[PDB]
Amino acid sequence: ELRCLCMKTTSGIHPKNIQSLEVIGKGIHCNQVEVIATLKDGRKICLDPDAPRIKKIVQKKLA
């Protein structure tokens, strides 16, 4: 990645609506951790990289 893709993050999405989630660590061109969720309708959405909230969605996805 050549720059930060996420500017503004949201919250309030039910895990039932999330198909997948990408956790992107800090890189050479982006000094921020980014969380992109692909919704069941196909929309890509930036989520608050709040570790407890993302870890709840992550466990619910693997179970």
Epitope: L5, C6, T10, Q32, C46
Partner: antibody, heavy 126, light 108 residues
Framework: QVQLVQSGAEVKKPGASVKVSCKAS????????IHWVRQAPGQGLEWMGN????????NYNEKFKSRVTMTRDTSTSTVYMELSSLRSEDTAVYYC???????????????????WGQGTLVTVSS | EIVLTQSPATLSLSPGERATLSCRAS??????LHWYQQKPGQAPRLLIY???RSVSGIPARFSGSGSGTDFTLTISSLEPEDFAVYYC?????????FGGGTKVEIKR
């Protein structure tokens, strides 16, 4: 009124540091990146870095990384740029500029910097 | 890091004439190329963003185009207020890069 209001002109001795502020008003602060661009006398534009009003995290040009700090204050809708170990070559007009509006949808298609501050002249002299 | 090359360095024309400004990118930057105007003593102003998209408050005479690494700004008919410096700027990747600028001066 949609504006970026920068702090006044500065005079600094070589080796000192300067902190320039940029106050946003009339728009959604959290929806635009804030860039810092400088222009040395009779020269072109040079990007120094940017800051996110949401995360408070900054991206720097490697050229300035060792002596620049960009910070934000959401309570006042103000961004700051601090430049240190000042030298004659740092005598320049420093501009802040917004890039957006961006939402919670990631993109690989970008807007330009549609709103610039008036600039802050920084003179490096003893 | 991207290098943006603007040509010519100086464009000398008369008011009412059409102006064509060029920007060449060292490598691809998708369509994330934007145009700015700067007048002496003033802050830069955005004219065109995303190669050809229109900007609120900007007059109709300004338009842009560009395929691959080649980009162009056109002023259909120069007004006295258009004799200024014009920069192209990319934000496809960081660090953001601007061209060296093109000064549009009155011909004599």
């Amino acid at each position: 009124q949609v504006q970026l209001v920068q702090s006044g002109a500065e005079v600094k001795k070589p080796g000192a540091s300067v902190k320039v502020s940029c106050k946003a008003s009339g728009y959604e602060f959290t929806s635009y990146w804030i860039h810092w661009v400088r222009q040395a006398p009779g020269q072109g534009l040079e990007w120094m870095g940017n800051i996110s009003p949401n995360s408070g995290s900054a991206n720097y040009n490697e050229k300035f990384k060792s002596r620049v700090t960009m910070t934000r204050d959401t309570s006042t809708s103000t961004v700051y740029m601090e430049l240190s170990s000042l030298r004659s070559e740092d005598t320049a007009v420093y501009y802040c500029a917004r890039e957006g509006p961006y939402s919670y949808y990631p993109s690989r298609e970008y807007y330009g910097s549609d709103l610039w501050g008036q600039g802050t002249l920084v003179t490096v002299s003893s | 890091e991207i290098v943006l090359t603007q040509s010519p360095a100086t464009l000398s024309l008369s008011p009412g004439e059409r102006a064509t400004l060029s920007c060449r990118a060292s490598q691809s930057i998708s369509n994330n190329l934007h145009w700015y105007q700067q007048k002496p003593g003033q802050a830069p102003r955005l004219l065109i963003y995303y190669t050809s998209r229109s900007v609120s408050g900007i007059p109709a005479r300004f338009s842009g185009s560009g395929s691959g690494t080649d980009f162009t700004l056109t002023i259909s008919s120069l007004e006295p207020e258009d004799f200024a410096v014009y920069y192209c700027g990319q934000n496809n990747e960081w660090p953001e890069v601007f061209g060296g600028g093109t000064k549009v001066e009155i011909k004599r």
